[PDB]
Design an enzyme around this catalytic site. Structure first.
Site, PDB file in Angstrom:
ATOM      1  N   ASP A   1       0.860  -1.186   0.000  1.00  0.00           N
ATOM      2  CA  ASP A   1       0.000   0.000   0.000  1.00  0.00           C
ATOM      3  C   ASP A   1       0.889   1.227   0.000  1.00  0.00           C
ATOM      4  O   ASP A   1       0.755   2.132   0.834  1.00  0.00           O
ATOM      5  CB  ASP A   1      -0.913  -0.078   1.216  1.00  0.00           C
ATOM      6  CG  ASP A   1      -2.035   0.953   1.231  1.00  0.00           C
ATOM      7  OD1 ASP A   1      -2.410   1.490   0.170  1.00  0.00           O
ATOM      8  OD2 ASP A   1      -2.557   1.197   2.362  1.00  0.00           O
TER       9      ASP A   1
HETATM   10  C1  LIG Z   1      -1.248  11.820  -3.997  1.00  0.00           C
HETATM   11  C2  LIG Z   1      -2.192  12.106  -2.828  1.00  0.00           C
HETATM   12  C3  LIG Z   1      -3.527  11.363  -2.965  1.00  0.00           C
HETATM   13  O1  LIG Z   1      -3.183   9.970  -2.817  1.00  0.00           O
HETATM   14  C4  LIG Z   1      -3.633   9.055  -3.662  1.00  0.00           C
HETATM   15  O2  LIG Z   1      -4.421   9.269  -4.551  1.00  0.00           O
HETATM   16  C5  LIG Z   1      -3.078   7.689  -3.426  1.00  0.00           C
HETATM   17  C6  LIG Z   1      -2.011   7.402  -4.469  1.00  0.00           C
HETATM   18  C7  LIG Z   1      -4.139   6.618  -3.296  1.00  0.00           C
HETATM   19  O3  LIG Z   1      -3.668   5.331  -3.707  1.00  0.00           O
HETATM   20  C8  LIG Z   1      -3.925   4.989  -5.055  1.00  0.00           C
HETATM   21  C9  LIG Z   1      -2.886   3.986  -5.499  1.00  0.00           C
HETATM   22  C10 LIG Z   1      -2.867   2.570  -4.948  1.00  0.00           C
HETATM   23  C11 LIG Z   1      -1.811   1.714  -5.632  1.00  0.00           C
HETATM   24  O4  LIG Z   1      -2.690   2.590  -3.524  1.00  0.00           O
HETATM   25  C12 LIG Z   1      -1.446   3.051  -2.965  1.00  0.00           C
HETATM   26  C13 LIG Z   1      -4.251   2.020  -5.186  1.00  0.00           C
HETATM   27  O5  LIG Z   1      -4.455   0.772  -4.525  1.00  0.00           O
HETATM   28  C14 LIG Z   1      -5.339   2.995  -4.803  1.00  0.00           C
HETATM   29  C15 LIG Z   1      -6.757   2.436  -4.742  1.00  0.00           C
HETATM   30  O6  LIG Z   1      -5.178   4.331  -5.168  1.00  0.00           O
HETATM   31  C16 LIG Z   1      -4.626   6.434  -1.912  1.00  0.00           C
HETATM   32  C17 LIG Z   1      -3.555   5.853  -0.978  1.00  0.00           C
HETATM   33  C18 LIG Z   1      -5.961   5.766  -1.648  1.00  0.00           C
HETATM   34  O7  LIG Z   1      -5.969   4.886  -0.573  1.00  0.00           O
HETATM   35  C19 LIG Z   1      -5.860   3.502  -0.683  1.00  0.00           C
HETATM   36  O8  LIG Z   1      -7.099   2.990  -1.149  1.00  0.00           O
HETATM   37  C20 LIG Z   1      -7.195   1.576  -1.179  1.00  0.00           C
HETATM   38  C21 LIG Z   1      -8.554   1.221  -1.776  1.00  0.00           C
HETATM   39  C22 LIG Z   1      -7.044   1.027   0.223  1.00  0.00           C
HETATM   40  C23 LIG Z   1      -5.657   1.455   0.711  1.00  0.00           C
HETATM   41  N1  LIG Z   1      -5.292   0.963   2.046  1.00  0.00           N
HETATM   42  C24 LIG Z   1      -6.146   1.486   3.133  1.00  0.00           C
HETATM   43  C25 LIG Z   1      -5.250  -0.517   2.091  1.00  0.00           C
HETATM   44  C26 LIG Z   1      -5.557   2.971   0.694  1.00  0.00           C
HETATM   45  O9  LIG Z   1      -4.249   3.384   1.079  1.00  0.00           O
HETATM   46  C27 LIG Z   1      -7.260   6.557  -1.725  1.00  0.00           C
HETATM   47  C28 LIG Z   1      -8.367   5.692  -2.315  1.00  0.00           C
HETATM   48  O10 LIG Z   1      -7.044   7.674  -2.614  1.00  0.00           O
HETATM   49  C29 LIG Z   1      -7.596   7.057  -0.329  1.00  0.00           C
HETATM   50  C30 LIG Z   1      -8.859   7.911  -0.245  1.00  0.00           C
HETATM   51  C31 LIG Z   1      -9.723   7.405   0.903  1.00  0.00           C
HETATM   52  C32 LIG Z   1      -8.503   9.359  -0.074  1.00  0.00           C
HETATM   53  N2  LIG Z   1      -7.989   9.945  -1.327  1.00  0.00           N
HETATM   54  C33 LIG Z   1      -9.087  10.238  -2.321  1.00  0.00           C
HETATM   55  C34 LIG Z   1      -6.952  11.011  -1.086  1.00  0.00           C
HETATM   56  C35 LIG Z   1      -7.598  12.394  -0.854  1.00  0.00           C
HETATM   57  C36 LIG Z   1      -5.900  10.995  -2.153  1.00  0.00           C
HETATM   58  O11 LIG Z   1      -6.451  11.362  -3.438  1.00  0.00           O
HETATM   59  C37 LIG Z   1      -4.587  11.766  -1.939  1.00  0.00           C
HETATM   60  C38 LIG Z   1      -4.126  11.460  -0.518  1.00  0.00           C
HETATM   61  O12 LIG Z   1      -4.845  13.175  -2.030  1.00  0.00           O
END
Ligand SMILES: CC[C@H]1OC(=O)[C@H](C)[C@@H](O[C@H]2C[C@@](C)(OC)[C@@H](O)[C@H](C)O2)[C@H](C)[C@@H](O[C@@H]2O[C@H](C)C[C@H](N(C)C)[C@H]2O)[C@](C)(O)C[C@@H](C)CN(C)[C@H](C)[C@@H](O)[C@]1(C)O
Ligand SMILES: Nc1nc2c(ncn2[C@@H]2O[C@H](CO)[C@@H](O)[C@H]2O)c(=O)[nH]1
Length: 300
Positions: free
Chosen positions: A199
């Site tokens: 993650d």
């Molecule tokens: C660059 C900064 C942004 O970061 C991202 O976009 C990340 C790359 C993204 O992560 C990207 C990339 C990748 C590879 O995770 C690292 C992928 O699995 C997901 C779904 O999206 C994150 C980690 C996701 O959160 C992950 O969501 C998974 C479904 C579960 C996982 N954990 C809890 C097991 C969790 O960390 C999420 C779904 O975006 C979290 C969501 C609740 C909140 N977001 C919408 C925020 C506001 C983000 O946009 C951000 C912080 O501003």
């Protein structure tokens, strides 16, 4: 009498059952569906992170996760949480005070800051830190009881996740074709697995004030699986430019690559829609489910 979000009395009692005496400022994040995360000062003058499982099914994950971190500690040239307390009702570790590589206010959809694209110290040190993680021996993972996926099992897991989304949701036809083509594209898939964080993105990487990677946090998804799992978010945040730099340095630092690695990472990033949809489904959270259904139905 001033209403505060944190229940100081209950937190004090919980921590004291495990040898920690809370005293001083604390901070509380309940956005987590599975844990309450508190950063609290203890009588050692130091801040500790209290990672509080909310329910029995979450508590069940503490013991295996603790074994992973114990194994990783000496084998990584950067810090990981030191779970000096690890039990079903409480995990606690001294806070790793270095900043995350992305800062965001809780609940917000927009970060305040992300380490810059042009930070060569960050890019370079992330690449070598990732090579170091991916060099942790498979045997060490097995000895620590980690979840292990062979290349075949790794590909099967992706297939299973795609199939579960296809059963539970209505998905844009082009996404379905993309995922199927990927699954059938032999040359994309690696012929080995490594220890992965699972993650990994800027919000789970710690940096010193020079922007050098100094630690990683939030290891619950760690396993032996497809290396590209840990590169998808780097592509997402730093683009193809950032990915190219990462792969060069990763390989130079001893990371094992294959010819279609960059392609595979992009397909893994697209597969994030599957991961999100299943997270949303399992969360039971209606806002997440609404976002997932909207994404899946939309053309990419
Ligand atoms: C660059 C900064 C942004 O970061 C991202 O976009 C990340 C790359 C993204 O992560 C990207 C990339 C990748 C590879 O995770 C690292 C992928 O699995 C997901 C779904 O999206 C994150 C980690 C996701 O959160 C992950 O969501 C998974 C479904 C579960 C996982 N954990 C809890 C097991 C969790 O960390 C999420 C779904 O975006 C979290 C969501 C609740 C909140 N977001 C919408 C925020 C506001 C983000 O946009 C951000 C912080 O501003
Ligand atoms: N800097 C820092 N942030 C942490 C630490 N532990 C948890 N966090 C934050 O709390 C979240 C949940 O564990 C993380 O994603 C970080 O935002 C830590 O040791 N150091």
């Amino acid at each position: 009498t001033v209403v505060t979000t944190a229940d100081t009395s209950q937190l004090y009692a919980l921590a004291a059952r495990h040898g920690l005496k809370l005293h001083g400022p604390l901070t509380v994040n309940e956005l987590g569906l599975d844990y309450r995360i508190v950063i609290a000062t203890v009588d050692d003058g130091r801040r500790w992170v209290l990672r509080i499982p909310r329910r029995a099914e979450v508590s069940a994950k503490v013991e295996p996760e603790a074994r992973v971190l114990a194994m990783l500690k000496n084998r990584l040239p950067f810090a990981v949480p030191d779970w000096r307390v690890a039990n079903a009702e409480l995990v606690a570790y001294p806070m790793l005070e270095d900043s995350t590589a992305m800062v965001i206010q809780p609940g917000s959809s927009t970060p305040d800051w992300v380490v810059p694209q042009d930070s060569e110290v960050f890019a370079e040190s992330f690449a070598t830190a990732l090579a170091a993680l991916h060099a942790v021996p498979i045997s060490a993972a097995v000895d620590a009881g980690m979840l292990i996926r062979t290349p075949t099992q790794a590909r099967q897991k992706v297939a299973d996740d795609v199939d579960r989304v296809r059963r539970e949701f209505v998905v844009n036809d082009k996404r379905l074709h993309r995922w199927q083509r990927w699954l059938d594209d032999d040359s994309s898939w690696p012929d080995f697995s490594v220890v992965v964080h699972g993650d990994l993105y800027v919000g789970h990487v710690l940096i010193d004030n020079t922007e050098r990677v100094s630690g990683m946090i939030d290891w619950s998804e760690a396993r032996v699986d497809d290396p590209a799992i840990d590169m998808a978010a780097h592509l997402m945040v730093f683009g193809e430019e950032g990915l190219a730099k990462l792969l060069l340095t990763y390989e130079a630092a001893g990371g094992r690559v294959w010819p279609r690695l960059a392609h595979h990472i992009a397909e893994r990033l697209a597969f994030g829609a599957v991961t999100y949809a299943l997270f949303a489904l399992d969360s039971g959270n209606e806002e997440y489910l609404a976002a997932a259904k909207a994404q899946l139905a939309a053309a990419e």
